[PDB]
Amino acid sequence: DNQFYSVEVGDSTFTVLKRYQNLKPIGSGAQGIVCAAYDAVLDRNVAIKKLSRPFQNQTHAKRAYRELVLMKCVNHKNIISLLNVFTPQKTLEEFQDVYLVMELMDANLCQVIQMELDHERMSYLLYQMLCGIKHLHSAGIIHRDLKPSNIVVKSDCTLKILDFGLARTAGTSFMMTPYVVTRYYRAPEVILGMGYKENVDIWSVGCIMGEMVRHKILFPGRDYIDQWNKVIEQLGTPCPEFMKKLQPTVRNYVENRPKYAGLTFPKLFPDSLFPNKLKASQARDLLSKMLVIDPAKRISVDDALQHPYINVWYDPAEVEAPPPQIYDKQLDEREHTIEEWKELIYKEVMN
Amino acid sequence: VVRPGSLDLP
Numbered sequence: 001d002n003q004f005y006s007v008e009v010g011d012s013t014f015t016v017l018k019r020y021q022n023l024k025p026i027g028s029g030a031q032g033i034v035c036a037a038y039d040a041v042l043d044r045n046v047a048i049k050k051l052s053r054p055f056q057n058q059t060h061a062k063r064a065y066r067e068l069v070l071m072k073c074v075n076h077k078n079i080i081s082l083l084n085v086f087t088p089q090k091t092l093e094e095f096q097d098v099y100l101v102m103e104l105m106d107a108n109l110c111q112v113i114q115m116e117l118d119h120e121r122m123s124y125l126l127y128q129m130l131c132g133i134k135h136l137h138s139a140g141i142i143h144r145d146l147k148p149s150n151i152v153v154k155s156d157c158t159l160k161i162l163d164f165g166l167a168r169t170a171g172t173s174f175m176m177t178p179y180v181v182t183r184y185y186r187a188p189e190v191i192l193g194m195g196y197k198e199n200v201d202i203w204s205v206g207c208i209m210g211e212m213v214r215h216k217i218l219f220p221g222r223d224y225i226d227q228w229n230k231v232i233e234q235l236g237t238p239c240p241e242f243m244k245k246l247q248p249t250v251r252n253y254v255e256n257r258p259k260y261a262g263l264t265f266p267k268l269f270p271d272s273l274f275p276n277k278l279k280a281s282q283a284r285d286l287l288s289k290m291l292v293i294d295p296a297k298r299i300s301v302d303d304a305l306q307h308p309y310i311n312v313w314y315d316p317a318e319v320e321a322p323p324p325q326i327y328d329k330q331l332d333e334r335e336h337t338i339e340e341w342k343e344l345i346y347k348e349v350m351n
Numbered sequence: 352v353v354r355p356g357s358l359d360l361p
Contacts, residue, residue, distance in 0.1 A: 107360045111360055115359065115360075120354075155358050157355045
C-alpha cells in the first residue's frame with residue numbers, strides 16, 4: 001500500500017506504516033514477533049509486536065481481542081501502553097495481521113537485579129511498581145504473574161509493567177530475553193490453590209524486592225512442592241488459621257510438613273546487603289510486611305504506598321490516577337466463532 | 352526531594 005511498506009524480519013515479514021523505520025527483531029515466540037523500530041513521526045523508539053496466527057483457532061482469536069481490550073483499560077505512566085495498533089489489510093475479508101505498537105524500554109528488572117542500588121533508586125523503582133499495580137487493580141486487573149522479566153525500565157530510572165492479564169506464553173516477556181519462570185514469584189494462595197485477591201501482587205513485589213536486595217532469587221523452587229518448602233523454610237510454617245483455609249488433601253500435606261521456625265528478617269536481609277541506617281531498617285520492615293504467607297496478614301497496595309520507605313515519593317496524581325475503563329470479566333466467559341472474533345478485533349483496530 | 356533521573360544500565 002501507499003501507506004505501508006514491507007520489511008523482512010528473519011522468516012517472517014513485517015508490513016508496517018511508513019513512519020516505523022529501521023525495524024530489527026528483539027524477541028520471538030510461537031505467539032508473536034517483536035521488533036524495535038524508530039517512529040519518525042514521534043522521533044522516538046518503539047516496540048512493534050506482530051501477533052502470530054491470531055485466527056489459527058478460537059482460542060488465539062479470543063486471546064487477540066482480549067489483549068486489545070486489556071490495553072484500552074489502562075492509561076498510566078507505570079504501565080506499558082498501546083501507542084498504536086494497525087493492520088496492513090484493507091478490508092475485513094482480507095484481514096489477517098494485527099500489529100501492536102508500544103513503548104520501547106531499555107531493560108527488564110533482571111538487569112537491575114545485579115546492580116547495587118542506593119535507597120533512592122530502590123524505593124523509587126518500587127514506588128513506580130506500586131503505582132502501576134494500583135492502577136491495574138483499579139481497572140479490575142490483578143496481575144498474579146509479576147516477575148523481573150515483565151517489569152521494564154529506562155536509563156532515566158522510569159519503570160513500566162507489561163503482560164497484565166496475558167497467559168504466560170502470549171506475553172511480550174516470553175518472547176524476549178532474559179526470561180525467568182513465573183513459579184518463583186507466585187503467592188502461596190496461588191500455588192496452594194486457595195484463590196486470591198489484590199495483594200497477590202504484593203507477594204510478587206516482595207519476592208522481586210528481596211531479589212534486588214540479595215542479588216539472588218528468593219525462592220528458587222525446582223517445582224511447586226520444592227517451591228512451598230523453600231518458602232516455609234525461610235519464612236516459617238504459617239499459622240493454623242491459614243492452613244484451615246486449604247482444600248482437604250493439600251491441607252493435610254501442608255499440615256504434615258515438618259514445622260519450621262523460619263529466619264528473622266534481619267537474618268534474611270543483613271545490613272551487609274544495604275548501604276542510611278533508618279532506610280535499611282525501613283526497607284527491611286517493608287519486606288517483612290510484603291513477604292507474608294497468609295494474604296489476610298499481608299500488606300495491601302495502599303499501605304505499601306503509605307509505608308515510610310516508599311511514601312517519600314508520594315504524588316496523589318500518580319497514585320489516584322483513575323483508569324479509562326474497568327475490565328469486564330464477562331469477557332473471560334464469552335464465546336464467539338473465529339470469524340466473529342475477527343470482526344470484533346477488526347473494529348477495534350480500525351477504531 | 353529530587354527523584355533519581357538516571358539508572359546505570361548495561
